[PDB]
Amino acid sequence: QSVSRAAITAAYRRPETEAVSMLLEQARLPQPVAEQAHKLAYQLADKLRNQKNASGRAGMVQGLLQEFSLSSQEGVALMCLAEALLRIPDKATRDALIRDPLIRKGVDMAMRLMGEQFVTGETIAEALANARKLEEKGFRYSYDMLGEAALTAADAQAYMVSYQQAIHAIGKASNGRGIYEGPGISIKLSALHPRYSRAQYDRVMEELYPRLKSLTLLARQYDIGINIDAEESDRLEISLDLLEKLCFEPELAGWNGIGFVIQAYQKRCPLVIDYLIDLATRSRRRLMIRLVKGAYWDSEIKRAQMDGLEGYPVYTRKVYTDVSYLACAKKLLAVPNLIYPQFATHNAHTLAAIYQLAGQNYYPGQYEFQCLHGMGEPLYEQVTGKVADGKLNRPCRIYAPVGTHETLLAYLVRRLLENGANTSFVNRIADTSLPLDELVADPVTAVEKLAQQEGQTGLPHPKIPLPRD
Ligand SMILES: Cc1cc2nc3c(=O)[nH]c(=O)nc-3n(C[C@H](O)[C@H](O)[C@H](O)COP(=O)(O)OP(=O)(O)OC[C@H]3O[C@@H](n4cnc5c(N)ncnc54)[C@H](O)[C@@H]3O)c2cc1C
């Protein structure tokens, strides 16, 4: 193929100067909206960073090391002494005194230790029971049965039963609350078909498609959201063929519970949106669309460098992804009859920009925010909840991984890459030396700043040359 599908294909790996140049005026926040977004972003990031006075406290340690001149060892040493001096019960005494196999096991252990913060429960019953606390406060949940990249027919069968079981449990706990207020499920197509990574069209339709359909019908019986997670870029096209067919199932007609992730770090993203708008129209439904930046960036970069093709399917500078996300968000927000946008982010500027771009006169079913468990709750503690409690009163859906240690590894590595990259907002917020204004800097303005320095808009990362170079 159709007009929208061909345009996707044609954008696959378009040059970055071109793709970024095209997004810029779509992502640019108008004057007033920009400043209200900056203000809100600053306030969110401030409260977040300085929750327990981290910056105030940083500036005490700095101003003591500065107006007396100690190292970060001599200053620590003095606090140890000041600490003991403040265990001396009587002030008179205090003042009088002063005046006068191994590698495999470490890897597995460090994974469990680091990973636990990202997991909501070992089983679906446990995760569901831990969900009332935040659900009272106005949070929603999407449960992710951890496990992906099924290597055998047995692996895939096991994931399929774990997903079926999960939908029963989630659905019974939902109890008719529906697709917006009630819990949903997230699935990975890679879990449902053996060797998904290289699967051919015909086998996927014959074997994957009947399983996707069956889980979706079950979700529909319970009236819960069922979201298709986005994985590696070379699976985008087959995921769209599966979505298309699923949208025209007679048993799914009139039901708006189908969810689908799109990744803004891909060049194709805006063209996928045009395709999705057309699919909701032809299939007579409102699609739930999670807009994310994307989780596989390091691997996509390595992959394209080994394939030696014309270019990258993703952007090479983080700021360009940020720009693509805002442009895609505007596109999504303009067609509320056709799409329920779910704006997944832990970035305070990102959140503030969406809040402002969504316009005045919010209504619950306009959009929601989303966040990953163990990453977003502090930001969204300021967002979800009553206005009289100082909150924005916008709903947030927490993506809740559910599993034991044996399903955790791939998810955890993605989290470590996310948390540990110097470009990540969650990494920069915890840096008290980075000024709030740079942390929440507008991406479009960031890109024009580069383009004036560098001589052109949207040049690739200087350390990430084309695969052929
Ligand atoms: C609820 C939820 C569901 C999600 N589901 C999926 C999913 O199904 N599939 C998926 O792929 N991702 C998914 N993600 C997104 C991903 O897991 C990260 O959480 C997200 O990309 C971080 O974006 P941010 O706005 O929070 O952070 P920011 O720090 O503002 O942006 C972070 C990122 O920018 C991108 N990036 C990093 N470096 C570069 C670079 N040099 N050039 C271009 N881009 C760069 C990467 O996408 C990285 O995640 C999901 C996220 C959430 C919150």
UniProtKB/Swiss-Prot annotation:
Domain of life: Bacteria
Induction, as annotated: By proline, autorepression and catabolite repression, and is potentially nitrogen controlled.
Residue ranges of the region described as Proline dehydrogenase: 101-433
Binding partners and assembly: Homodimer.
Family membership noted in the UniProt record: In the N-terminal section; belongs to the proline dehydrogenase family.
Reported function: Oxidizes proline to glutamate for use as a carbon and nitrogen source and also function as a transcriptional repressor of the put operon.
Protein name, per record: Bifunctional protein PutA
Organism: Escherichia coli (strain K12)
Phylogenetic lineage: Bacteria, Pseudomonadati, Pseudomonadota, Gammaproteobacteria, Enterobacterales
